[PDB]
Symmetry: C3
Subunit: 143 residues, 3 copies
Amino acid sequence: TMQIKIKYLDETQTRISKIEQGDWIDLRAAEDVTIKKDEFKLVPLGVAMELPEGYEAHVVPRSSTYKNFGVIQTNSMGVIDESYKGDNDFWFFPAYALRDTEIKKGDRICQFRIMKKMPAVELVEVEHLGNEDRGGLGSTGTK
Amino acid sequence: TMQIKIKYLDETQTRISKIEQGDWIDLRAAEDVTIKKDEFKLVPLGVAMELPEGYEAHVVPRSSTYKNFGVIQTNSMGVIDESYKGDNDFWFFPAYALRDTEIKKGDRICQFRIMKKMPAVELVEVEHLG
Amino acid sequence: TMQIKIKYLDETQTRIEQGDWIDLRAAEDVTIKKDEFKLVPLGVAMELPEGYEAHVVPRSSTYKNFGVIQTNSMGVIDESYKGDNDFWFFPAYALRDTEIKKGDRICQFRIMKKMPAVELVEVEHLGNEDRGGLGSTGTK
Ligand SMILES: O=c1ccn([C@H]2C[C@H](O)[C@@H](CO)O2)c(=O)[nH]1
Ligand SMILES: O=c1ccn([C@H]2C[C@H](O)[C@@H](CO)O2)c(=O)[nH]1
Ligand SMILES: O=c1ccn([C@H]2C[C@H](O)[C@@H](CO)O2)c(=O)[nH]1
Ligand SMILES: [Cl-]
Ligand SMILES: [Mg+2]
Ligand SMILES: [Mg+2]
């Protein structure tokens, strides 16, 4: 009942779809891409969207992206804000190749979902927090 | 209170626990694992789960996973689909080693939480955005 | 609106809202050699609103600008990480020789309601069909 408007780069793009057993929706390479080991490439995904107001999208690799295509996503998880909704606001997957690789036009290389943006907040500067330190970075150990 | 049903691989798995100061729950290597520099391995986590209706899980490394074990998680954040709830649907951590490393059975290498899935959405194709 | 309390490491930290992710900055100059790791201190400590965690990822431009990836992918700031010396960091692995400058925006965060109290019930048998995983749906 919530609507996402999607505009494809052109008629040759493979239209994306929801599968029953996929909680996120797979996105696809807009063209063939060859990447060399230890080299980078913004893979075009060939979609621009208008998300429901107050929502954002998150894009991450699929668990099989590394096995299939030998790339990692350099920004970890991509955030697409509701405002990135213009007629030429296409989506890109930033890929770093850990081995030589070829991605084919139409290949499902990552996945996305939408969720509400964070609530309105204000940052209030203080001089002192007055809380006990938790610690971090492996303070609880490993065993 | 919601229930997560957890089935372990075997009785040698260290049962997982929520700690007071951990908003996400730590998952553990199901066996000893060796990974050489610049190689990949799916680290078994030894758990299969049924999440409450309408929920997915997300998995990320601990901030100390890299320092302690020299690995990154190749899919950045794993998404455990709600349907991944069968008796053979055991969870895994996709590790790429940036140096030679050893992980031991029971070591806490990543963490998880649950979240409501994206609702049903309608994908409406348009020729132009407004 | 919800309040976040923020304490800066010192007076030299660059000071930082309608729902967008919030940019965080390096607290000092950082030099990282190719194929080496460095915590980048972010010079901030915070007390988030009751019941909230924070999530930290790189900015879209971080790789282009600095040649680093975030080793834990998305950092989770636990609500209890609110002490006077609980300063946030960005765990960075350099894929090239790089210099990060004090005050440079390098990652971004938002808050989110933490997972509520859940009961973990061990069972002997799930009784559902297997979905399969790790690329069970293929690529085409
Ligand atoms: O992984 C990403 C992250 C962001 N964007 C879009 C939305 C964002 O506003 C713009 C600038 O980063 O690019 C992408 O295409 N891919
Ligand atoms: O990091 C991950 C990602 C996925 N899976 C499983 C669950 C998911 O439903 C399926 C395909 O992504 O494989 C994992 O065990 N770990
Ligand atoms: O990327 C990260 C991840 C974690 N932490 C802190 C907050 C958290 O509660 C603690 C343990 O992960 O370390 C950071 O500052 N940055
Ligand atoms: Cl998030
Ligand atoms: Mg999938
Ligand atoms: Mg922890």
